Design a protein around this motif. Structure first.
Motif, PDB file in Angstrom:
ATOM      1  N   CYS C 310       0.818  -1.227   0.000  1.00  0.00           N
ATOM      2  CA  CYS C 310       0.000   0.000   0.000  1.00  0.00           C
ATOM      3  C   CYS C 310       0.845   1.268   0.000  1.00  0.00           C
ATOM      4  O   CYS C 310       0.293   2.351  -0.168  1.00  0.00           O
ATOM      5  N   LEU C 315      -1.569   2.376   8.342  1.00  0.00           N
ATOM      6  CA  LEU C 315      -2.846   1.797   7.881  1.00  0.00           C
ATOM      7  C   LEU C 315      -3.615   1.324   9.117  1.00  0.00           C
ATOM      8  O   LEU C 315      -3.294   0.251   9.664  1.00  0.00           O
ATOM      9  N   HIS C 334       2.697  -4.627   6.099  1.00  0.00           N
ATOM     10  CA  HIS C 334       1.698  -4.805   7.172  1.00  0.00           C
ATOM     11  C   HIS C 334       1.172  -6.239   7.214  1.00  0.00           C
ATOM     12  O   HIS C 334       1.170  -6.923   6.152  1.00  0.00           O
ATOM     13  N   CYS C 337      -1.974  -6.328   4.664  1.00  0.00           N
ATOM     14  CA  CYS C 337      -1.508  -6.311   3.269  1.00  0.00           C
ATOM     15  C   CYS C 337      -0.833  -7.637   2.923  1.00  0.00           C
ATOM     16  O   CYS C 337      -1.199  -8.257   1.916  1.00  0.00           O
TER      17      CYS C 337
HETATM   18 ZN    ZN Z   1      -0.291  -1.719   4.460  1.00  0.00          ZN
END
Ligand code: ZN
Ligand code: ZN
Lengths: 260, 549, 370, 98, 170
Positions: C310, C315, C334, C337
């Motif tokens: 991302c 996030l 993350h 993700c």
């Molecule tokens: Zn992310």
């Protein structure tokens, strides 16, 4: 001479008309023609898988090489003190060594050239990046040659297969002994001698002749009159002899000195 | 540097040496050689001079060697089997008949194991394997008395047979196999007795196994063939080579593969699987290599050097199990028959000319320019041949196209369609005038309706058969026959032929007269007796067509 | 034609029926100047739901990856003729895809002429050529003294058609190729483009010299953007037009909202003072009324510490925490993700609370524990 | 053959490419169109062609008179063609205009 | 049995990563840009657009429509529709540094000449790329929009007092 079977010799020749001819049991196949005149000799060279050459040497201090599988001059050379055929390199396939005249030096084995007529060629601004490309190109070209030969063999095999396929497509005891032909004056008489199996009481038979169109470029209808011949054999069971015969004119057929 | 050295040369006929018979052997640095003649030669391989030559009588047909005993066994053709001490107390030496042992004068093949000898002897229809002692202690070199014989009843008869010994692990000029393959092929009896086995490949192409321990016989105990000799595989064609390879190589090598070879190129390979049902199974592959194979050998690691009349090639079996297809690169050496392979790769051969040779497999300024020149000359040399072969291929394609059109016409002409569409031939009678007398002619019109073009190779055959019912007196003309070539007929086109039927002699025409057309296709003309005929129409002329009002 | 009596001849000439009843065909099938062995046995009737079709191993290796399609087409296809059409089409596709392994040039035109032409150029130029002699690459110099390359890719017929030219510089390169033109011709066009684009190069070289360029590193020559760093924890990205480099660029600011605002203000107020006769730096310095730092930190310039899916930090509370067990990637992610990414790939396998998979960037084993 | 009554598919003759004794000799040992024309007075041809049978006053009746002995004169009488392309006895083509 | 591999399986790893990123919804194109900066950063600073734009035109077989019909599709029409749209958006973004020879082969596919059930978005992004090269003036009514939309917009602008500007030049 090239080979011998049982008596049957296969044989190269060469002549006064600057030719080079083959023969397979008296069968002049695959004639060639030579550039220079007054030929002295031929030797043979193998060069690898199938690549037979004939190296021909002449009186006028020059020589040629003709590539069997296509009776065609693959190379010519000039002034040729000598020609030799052997493996000078160590590869296990013959080469040809060509010695060029003693005008250069008072020595023999200078001014040479060694040539398989392929990958092997020897003789007496980075550029290095180009080389392996060319070497791979040589190897690819050689591989393509070696592959084409096999592809061509396979096509011939398939054509044979399909000839036999036709023959069995349309369709054992010998209905006919054998064939013979004579010439009387201006007639050809062709006759064939039957066997017990063929009963001329029950079967109308004829005997046609067909010209090979390779000779017959034209629409000559060829005509043939047919007789049957019964002769009794020492009646004085008892053998009869029926034979079947066809008669035609000759002179329409000897336009090309020959016909089949 | 030079990968091929030539050691000496020998007498070649026209063509070259025949195959089967020539043999090369190597001990350490000596090389023993037969060329299928009355001689056997020994070359010291350091400087390839002949130490010694041995004149046998009649065509040495096989050789074998014992290193420990320092002996050399040889097989004369119609005489028997000689032994020669290499010490051997001009360099040519004639062999004295004292050296003959078992002069069977009919033995075609033989081999050797540790304390045992095995022969194979021709007779009438049934050929027969034998088995002899061979004295363990260094003594007068004797055969001993035959332990056993058999009769290969399966064989009922240029190409000699071949023998190969196969021992297992635990128990010799043969091959030691692995226990899996040994048990798979020969069974539990051989596996438990630790028995060597003998594989005889015969000119029929059958490849038979014999266990030796089982082959003990006498005049009170004759050998049963159907029990004692058994048959692995039936190659259709003669046998050249049997061997074994250590595929998966990952002196005493425990082989995993069994190789055989036909004259015409049927290779055969056998391996152990233990696959797919929890059971030991054999993986066979009958490959089909090119060429008449002339000789073969076996080198390190699943490689099999063989030879053709073209070139010395090589095959690899090393990697389902082993291999789907066999692809086989040449090594750019000529047709060597009689190949031997020692490992250190350095093999020995006899060229089919006649040469003995030792094949040993494994920047600069302006010389680079000369190199570029040489490479371009090479490619230019080969391309001018590749061109020619492409054109040959074009012509063979053209042949195939013509033949295809022929088969299509033929199938249409033989078929039933209720209308004679593809090619038709009508006849129609017409009275004409020649000098004074009216003549009766027949016009035979040939018509192509269909697309198919009758290109070169086809010919019309008309035949007019006079009155029928064979008589007391054979007539002067039972039939007249016409043939015309058809050329470039094509679709929609039409050809026309007029023929006389009418009285040339006596003013007498006998009816009915039947005029019959056919078509003949010739296979040759576009390039057992070979052609085909096809039966177009058949018109009978009777009085009603011959009346004139 | 309509019926399979002449259409079959015209579209597969080298298929010969062996048998009278047209059930066994054998011979060769053509594709891109190449004939392949083929034997296609039908049953006693005209049905392809079951038939035999054997090939040469050449043809099998060339139909690798389509065996299922051909098997399906045997059962789905009404007639033999259409099956042959489909097979020729499929062969053409297979060969045009694997054009690397299957080719042979015409040497008498090709191999000699290319060396003749490279000699016409001069052998100081050429730097690389591939073993198939398909790819070559040439060099040229600027008057400023910069090396610029040009890749060509050549066909079986080089002089007939145009060779594919690949060049780095950012404006689209146009090369008028004739069959009469050659490598010297395209090389002259290349030098023309070079001397035209001189000015753009000068600007970007001046930036790369006198500034802490930040996120292209070892930039290519195609690149028109240069995120320059200034002060601390603020940067300016700057996109330049090749035809009009010295003209004003689209420019804006990253960093701290309290630091960036006066910079936008000062830019707005001074943007009319831009002048395309000076340099970009010499205009930016008096526009924004500041000087630059020359590599305030040359070692720890910046390591992008963002999700690598991302490309965001923060996030939904989560931080870049999950990393690669690799010295060469070290790329954070993350949980969310990387889970959404790995749950897609075929290589990945899920234990109770564990997913093993490949790191997106480097394709090395990476483990995620939810 | 083209103008003939039947309009039926006849093969074209194409006379022999060589004499057969000439072929024998060659084997054993191994361009513009030509034109001619005439002119003649219309008055002469009219007064000679009087009894004007039918057709155009000139060129057509002239061709009828030129071919009055040929078997295919009725065809040209009907079609009234002032020009034709016949063959020959020796296979060659010949085109005759008036 | 019914496992399908990803149609970017056989491609260069970075292209694989790009096409994996663009798959991810409307933020697919921004993610494509992040990917390209993250390969300017790595050892292979250039990205081989000329190789990807060949792979995008390379054809493979599919069987769609009825149970049986063999057809040959290029990649661009075989990879997921959001990958498609976010591709063509990213090609708008980096048009200047692309080879035209590849682009035109791509736009010809996007045009979907002679197809039923076209992709209006692909066709429209095709048109908008042509217009930006300057080889698709086309002398047509070839606009990104539909004839339906263009007509319903004529229908409304007709109900408005035309302005004194002169923008069309008769
Ligand atoms: Zn992310
Ligand atoms: Zn990683």
């Amino acid at each position: 001479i090239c080979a011998t079977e049982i008596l049957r010799i296969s044989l190269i020749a060469l002549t006064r008309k600057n030719q080079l001819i083959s023969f397979q049991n008296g069968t002049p196949k695959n004639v060639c023609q030579l550039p220079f005149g007054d030929p002295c000799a031929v030797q043979l060279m193998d060069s690898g898988g199938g690549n037979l050459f004939f190296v021909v040497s002449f009186i006028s201090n020059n020589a040629c090489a003709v590539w069997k599988e296509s009776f065609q001059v693959a190379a010519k050379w000039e002034k040729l003190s000598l020609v030799l055929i052997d493996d000078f390199i160590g590869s296990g396939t013959e080469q040809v060594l060509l010695l060029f005249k003693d005008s250069l030096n008072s020595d023999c084995l200078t001014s040479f050239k060694i040539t398989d007529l392929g990958k092997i060629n020897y003789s007496s601004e980075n550029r290095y990046l180009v080389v392996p490309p060319l070497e791979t190109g040589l190897k690819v070209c050689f591989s393509s040659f070696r592959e084409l030969r096999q592809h061509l063999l396979l096509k011939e095999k398939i054509i044979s297969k399909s000839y036999k396929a036709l023959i069995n497509l349309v369709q054992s005891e010998q209905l006919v002994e054998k064939i013979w032909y004579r010439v009387i004056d201006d007639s050809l008489v062709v006759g064939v001698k039957t066997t017990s199996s063929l009963k001329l009481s029950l079967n109308d038979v004829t005997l046609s002749l067909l010209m090979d169109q390779a000779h017959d470029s034209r629409f000559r209808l060829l005509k043939c009159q047919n007789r049957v011949i019964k002769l009794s054999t020492n009646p004085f069971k008892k053998e009869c002899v029926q034979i079947i015969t066809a008669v035609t004119s000759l002179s329409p057929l000897l336009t090309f000195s020959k016909f089949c | 540097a030079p990968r091929v050295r030539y050691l000496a040369g020998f007498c070649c006929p026209l063509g070259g040496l025949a195959a089967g018979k020539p043999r090369v052997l190597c001990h350490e640095a000596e090389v023993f050689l037969s060329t299928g003649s009355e001689l056997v030669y020994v070359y010291d391989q350091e400087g390839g001079l002949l130490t010694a030559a041995f004149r046998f009588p009649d065509q040495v047909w096989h050789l074998e060697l014992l290193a420990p005993r320092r002996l050399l066994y040889a097989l004369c053709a119609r005489r028997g089997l000689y032994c020669l001490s290499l010490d051997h107390p001009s360099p040519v030496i004639p062999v004295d008949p004292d050296a003959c042992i078992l002069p069977d004068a009919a033995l075609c093949a033989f081999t050797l194991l540790d304390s045992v000898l095995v022969t194979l002897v021709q007779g009438p229809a049934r050929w027969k394997m034998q088995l002899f002692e061979q004295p363990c202690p260094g003594e007068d070199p004797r055969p001993g008395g035959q332990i056993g014989e058999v009769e290969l009843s399966s064989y009922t008869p240029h190409f000699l047979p071949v023998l190969c010994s196969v021992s297992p692990s635990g128990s010799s000029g043969g091959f030691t196999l692995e226990d899996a393959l040994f048990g798979l092929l020969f069974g539990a009896d051989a596996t438990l007795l630790q028995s060597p086995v003998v594989l005889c490949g015969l000119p029929d192409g059958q490849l038979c196994c014999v266990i030796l321990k089982a082959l003990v016989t006498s005049r009170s105990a004759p050998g049963d063939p159907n029990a004692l000799v058994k048959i692995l595989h039936h190659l259709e064609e003669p046998v050249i080579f049997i061997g074994a390879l250590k595929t998966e190589p990952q002196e005493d090598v425990h082989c995993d593969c069994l190789v055989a070879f036909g004259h015409h190129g049927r290779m055969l390979a056998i391996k152990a699987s233990w696959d797919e049902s929890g059971k030991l199974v054999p993986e066979l592959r009958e490959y089909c290599l090119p060429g008449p194979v002339l000789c073969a050998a076996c080198g390190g690691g699943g490689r099999v050097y063989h030879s053709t009349p073209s070139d010395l090639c090589v095959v690899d079996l090393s990697r389902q199990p082993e291999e789907g297809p066999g692809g086989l690169p040449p090594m750019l050496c000529p047709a060597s028959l009689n190949i031997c392979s020692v490992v250190s790769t350095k093999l020995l051969a006899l060229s089919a000319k006649g040469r003995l040779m030792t094949c040993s497999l494994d920047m600069t300024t302006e010389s680079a320019g000369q190199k570029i020149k040489e490479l371009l000359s090479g490619i230019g040399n080969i391309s001018e041949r590749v061109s020619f072969l492409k054109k040959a291929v074009d012509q063979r394609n053209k042949a195939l196209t013509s033949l295809n059109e022929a088969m299509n016409v033929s199938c249409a002409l033989l078929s039933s369609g209720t209308g004679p569409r593809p090619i038709s031939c009508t006849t129609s009678t017409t009275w004409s005038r020649l000098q004074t007398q009216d003549v009766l002619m027949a016009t035979c019109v040939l018509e192509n309706s269909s697309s198919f073009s009758l290109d070169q190779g086809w010919t019309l055959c008309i035949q007019v058969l006079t009155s029928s019912c064979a008589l007391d007196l054979d007539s002067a003309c039972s039939a007249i026959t016409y043939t015309i070539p058809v050329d470039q007929l094509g679709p929609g086109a039409r050809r026309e032929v007029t023929l006389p039927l009418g009285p040339g002699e006596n003013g007498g025409l006998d009816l009915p007269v039947t005029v019959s057309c056919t078509l003949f296709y010739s296979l040759r003309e576009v390039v057992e007796q070979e052609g085909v005929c096809l039966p177009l129409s058949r018109h009978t002329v009777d009085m009603l067509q011959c009346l004139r009002f | 034609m309509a019926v399979t009596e002449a259409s079959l001849l015209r579209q597969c000439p080298l298929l010969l029926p062996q048998n009278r009843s047209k059930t066994v065909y054998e011979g060769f099938i053509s594709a891109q100047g190449r004939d392949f062995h083929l034997r296609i046995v039908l049953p006693e009737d005209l049905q392809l739901k079951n038939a035999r079709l054997l090939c040469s191993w050449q043809l099998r290796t060339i139909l690798s990856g389509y065996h299922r399609i051909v098997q399906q087409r045997m059962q789905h296809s009404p007639d033999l003729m259409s099956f042959m059409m489909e097979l020729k089409m499929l062969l053409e596709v297979a060969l045009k895809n694997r054009q690397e392994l299957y080719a042979l040039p015409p040497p008498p035109q090709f191999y000699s002429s290319l060396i003749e032409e490279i000699g016409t150029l001069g052998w100081d130029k050429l730097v690389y050529a591939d073993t198939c002699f398909s790819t070559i690459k040439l060099k040229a110099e600027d008057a400023s003294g910069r090396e610029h390359l040009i890749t060509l890719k050549l066909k079986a017929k080089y002089p007939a058609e145009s060779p594919d030219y690949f060049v780095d510089f950012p404006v689209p390169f146009c090369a008028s190729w004739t069959p009469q033109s050659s490598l010297i011709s395209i090389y002259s066009q290349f030098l023309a483009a070079i001397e035209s684009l001189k000015a753009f190069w000068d600007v970007m070289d001046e930036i790369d010299e006198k500034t802490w360029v930040l996120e292209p590193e070892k930039p290519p020559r195609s690149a028109t953007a240069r995120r320059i760093a200034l002060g601390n924890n603020v940067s300016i990205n700057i996109e330049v037009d090749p035809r009009h480099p010295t003209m004003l660029p689209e420019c804006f600011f990253l960093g701290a909202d309290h630091v960036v605002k006066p910079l936008g203000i000062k830019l707005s107020r001074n943007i009319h003072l831009w002048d395309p006769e000076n340099s970009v730096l010499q205009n930016l310095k008096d526009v924004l009324e500041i000087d630059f730092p020359a590599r305030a930190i040359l070692e720890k310039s910046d390591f992008t510490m963002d999700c690598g899916i991302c490309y965001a930090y923060q996030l939904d509370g989560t931080i870049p925490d999950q990393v690669c067990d690799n010295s060469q990637c070290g790329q954070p992610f993350h949980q969310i993700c990387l889970y959404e990414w790995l749950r897609g790939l075929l290589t990945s396998r899920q234990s109770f609370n564990i997913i093993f998979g490949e790191c997106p960037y480097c394709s090395k084993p990476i483990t995620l524990k939810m | 053959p083209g103008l003939a009554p039947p309009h039926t598919r006849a093969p074209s003759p194409l006379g022999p490419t060589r004499d057969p004794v000439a072929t024998f000799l060659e084997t054993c040992r191994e361009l513009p169109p030509s034109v001619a024309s005439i002119k003649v007075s219309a008055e002469l041809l009219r007064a000679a062609l009087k009894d004007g049978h039918s057709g155009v006053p000139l060129c057509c009746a002239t061709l009828q008179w030129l071919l009055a002995e040929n078997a295919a004169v009725d065809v040209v009488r009907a079609r009234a063609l002032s020009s034709i392309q016949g063959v020959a006895p020796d296979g060659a083509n010949v085109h005759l205009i008036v | 049995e019914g496992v399908e591999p990803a149609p970017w399986a056989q491609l260069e790893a970075p292209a694989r990563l790009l096409l994996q990123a663009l798959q991810a919804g409307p933020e697919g194109a921004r993610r494509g840009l992040g990917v390209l900066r993250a390969l300017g950063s790595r050892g292979w600073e250039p990205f081989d657009w000329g190789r990807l734009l060949e792979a995008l035109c390379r054809e493979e077989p599919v069987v769609q429509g009825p149970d049986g019909r063999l057809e040959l599709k290029p990649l661009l029409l075989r990879l997921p529709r959001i990958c498609q749209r976010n591709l063509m958006s990213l090609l708008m973004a980096v048009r200047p540094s692309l080879p035209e020879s590849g682009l035109l082969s791509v736009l010809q596919i996007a045009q979907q000449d002679l197809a039923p059930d076209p992709d209006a978005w692909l066709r429209a992004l095709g048109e908008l790329l042509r217009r930006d090269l300057g080889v698709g003036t086309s002398m047509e009514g070839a606009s990104p929009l539909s004839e339906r939309c263009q007509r319903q917009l004529q229908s409304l602008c007709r109900g408005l007092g035309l302005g004194g500007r002169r923008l069309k030049s008769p």
